[PDB]
A paper describes a structure:
L-aspartate aminotransferase (AST, EC 2.6.1.1) is not only a key metabolic enzyme that links amino acid metabolism to carbohydrate metabolism through reversible transamination reaction but also an enzyme that regulates the cellular level of amino acid by catalyzing amino acid degradation and biosynthesis. AST generally forms a homodimer consisting of two active sites in the vicinity of subunit interfaces; these active sites bind to its cofactor PLP and substrate independently. The active site is situated in the cavity formed by two large domains and one small domain.
In this study, to suggest a broader view of the three-dimensional structure and show the structural features of PLP-family proteins, we determined the crystal structure of AST from Schizosaccharomyces pombe. The structure of SpAST forms a very stable homodimer with an unusually extended interface. Each subunit of SpAST folds up into three spatially and functionally distinct regions: a large domain, a small domain, and the N-terminal arm. Two tyrosine residues in both of the large domains, Tyr298 in helix α11, forms a face-to-face pi interaction with each other within a distance of 4 Å, contributing to stable dimerization of the dimer. Unexpectedly, two additional electron densities were found at the active site and the surface that could be fitted to phosphate and glycerol molecules. A clear density that could be fitted in most likely a phosphate was found in the active site of SpAST.
Numbering used by the authors:
A (entry chain A): 2 to 410
B (entry chain B): 2 to 409
Write the structure that this text describes.
């Protein structure tokens, strides 16, 4: 202001933040927030996983417990265990010392690490662009653009068929310049919820390799999506068979409910230990000059679970609890729309997976739901299934039924 | 590697890391780690502050405790109280809604936030360089250079007088281009430990004001340094009188022992609420595109202490415990060097404050201390007092005495 800062333009309101403001001002007792991006139980409350609560109690009583700095790359028994749970069918990647793992400030910080590294050591001399799904998590675009990488998209949501636009994605893969960067969702695509089949994945991998593209997997919902850890990491482990180095950005925010503790890991899967160590040393330079070292509390908890056979088994029970409740809400919503004979097909509701769903509603229909049924969710029709429970799912189905019947497109 | 990554050259190890590796390989029973980057108690061990142990139990036993996402700018009860403890003499800054406060990944993350914002909204319009003390924490230079700002230095360590180079710093402030960026240490200068006196600060501020420089304060040791929170933030609050907007990067790593939980805050002290809100909205964009939101555990602990009068009083006792122990070690070391009649003057050991000290030892004397007395510290003579205690301080004094006498 003695320095020109009053000339700055104040930034536009965050998308999620402005919806939340409107939800909170609504005075109707039947209102529902269907934009919450975190798991909720059947009463609509945050839910601490019993295994996580148990692990944090165990950790706090340990004689060695303290608040001292971690190594720059993070807590070693966390980074090692985080890689192991991704690659249970491929333990040789760890034992051959081929995975460079950096504990990160959750999934977003892992993406920031990978993108910073890839921009400096790949984009600089190749001019490659990064390709993200259309639609995707909106930070995927701005995070990469802020680091100076040009962002392109590949088609993903086929709105007419309410399904995955396999042919559009494949066509973009084949026509993109060789050696482009492709940001892939490992499972439970955000925001649509619809994943490629295994058959579609194999064809996707074939074309990615034929064009020599560089692959970055984002895996934010392993185990949380299906309750089965190896099923949810299937695409990652299938890609290992092709013997191309690649990157993985991993979050424990949802599958351990650690959200605000910021527990994640970035991995580079090298072809040999020598390159693993070259890359790791450069990743440490980025880490040193952004955060210095990562937060310990969530990592200690995750390492405790992952390295204990009994806590691991109890965590898998908690994953089953969460994934089953979402599946049950998807079934309830779809079953009510079928019973109400709502125009259109509604099987995409149960063919999708994870806590986000592209419903297929239009902006007019979403606005109708907001004004007449006090449902708050995104204009593109994305809902969070976590907001749905036994007390409101019939109200939600009735709203959708009315909106679609009243406002056909 | 199918992508050219085998052509990357492996970065060389950090000097501190390589030093610690050498310390732990040394089998000599009298070895001392003089490079510990964190507080240690009188027995050489990590030390959880009693108030922090109490605060964390209170936090986790609270009925509403959970692990949910914080807002982009962090836990409001933390960021408000983090500003309050900096500006206790100046409560009008908060009541007029003039402080934009962003919870960060400790002091490093606060610095990254401040530097990213200043590069984007100040440096690219003015061409300003940032001036850091010579010496300073080495990440200050690389953090700013990585973001595209040219880094200059101002003189700080007077090696011949073993003191603060006031005239050199003042001369650089006066000759730097108008509108330059100056990174200042609020108290307990890292790595020398020597601070400007209050009268030197007043003259420093006048010259900064007359050249219209932009000021960024780093405050990583408030309360930890002297045991007195308001004394340690005196320079911050004195600068408030000059009515220029400015930045503060705050860390709770040392003063709450929260090191690995990564608890800190960046503040922009605006002239008015309008610009405060403009800057804050741009800070949130940077934060959204790097970490999304900051880690909750340490911030909840800090907010519990800072918002409770009784816990705050307990924490102030822990601050007295830590600062007193470091002062006593400095006194023990200084008094032994005086009694050993070690050539040179050693009052700088007790005129410095905080955990880090420039000893004045030469590289050959430091190397002598490592090989003959198994003391591990930096070749510029910087030591950490945290590793000193009753079991080894006399060994350290005798090493310095021998090193200085043998290598004049």
């Amino acid at each position: 202001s003695d320095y020109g800062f009053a000339n700055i333009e104040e930034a536009k309101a965050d998308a999620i933040f402005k919806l939340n403001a409107q939800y909170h001002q609504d005075e109707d007792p039947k209102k529902v927030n269907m934009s919450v991006g975190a798991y909720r139980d059947d009463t609509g409350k945050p839910w601490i996983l019993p295994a996580v609560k148990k692990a944090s109690k165990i950790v706090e009583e340990q004689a060695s417990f303290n608040h001292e700095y971690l190594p720059i790359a993070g807590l070693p028994r966390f980074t090692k265990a985080a890689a192991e749970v991704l690659f249970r069918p491929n333990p040789h990647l760890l034992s051959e010392d081929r995975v460079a793992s950096m504990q990160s400030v959750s999934g977003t910080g892992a993406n920031f690490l990978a993108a910073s590294f890839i921009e400096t050591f790949y984009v600089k001399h190749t001019g490659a662009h990064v390709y993200i799904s259309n639609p995707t998590w909106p930070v995927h675009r701005t995070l990469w653009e802020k680091l100076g990488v040009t962002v392109e998209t590949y088609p993903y949501w086929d709105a007419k068929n309410r399904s995955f636009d396999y042919e559009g994605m494949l066509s973009t893969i084949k026509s993109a310049p060789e050696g482009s960067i492709f940001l892939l969702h490992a499972c439970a695509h955000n925001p649509t919820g619809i994943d490629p089949t295994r058959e579609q994945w194999l064809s996707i991998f074939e074309s990615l390799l034929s064009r020599k593209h560089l692959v970055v997997f984002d895996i934010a919902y392993q185990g949380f999506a299906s309750g089965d850890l190896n099923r949810d990491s299937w695409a990652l482990n299938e890609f290992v068979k092709y013997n191309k180095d690649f990157f993985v950005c991993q979050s424990f925010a949802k599958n351990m409910g650690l959200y605000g503790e910021r527990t994640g890991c970035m991995h580079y899967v090298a072809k040999d230990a020598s390159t693993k160590n070259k890359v790791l040393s450069q990743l440490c330079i980025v880490q040193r000059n952004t955060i210095s070292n990562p937060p310990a509390y969530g990592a200690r908890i995750a390492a405790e679970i992952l390295n204990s056979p009994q806590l691991f088994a109890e965590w898998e029970q908690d994953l089953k609890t969460m994934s089953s409740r979402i599946i049950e809400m998807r079934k309830r919503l779809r079953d009510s729309l079928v019973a109400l004979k709502t125009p259109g097909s509604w099987d995409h509701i149960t063919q999708q997976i994870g806590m986000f769903s592209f419903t297929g509603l239009t902006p007019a229909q979403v606005q109708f739901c907001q004004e007449r049924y006090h449902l708050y969710f995104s204009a593109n029709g994305r809902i969070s299934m976590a907001g749905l429970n036994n007390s409101n799912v019939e109200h939600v189905a009735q709203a959708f039924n009315h909106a679609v019947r009243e406002l056909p497109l």
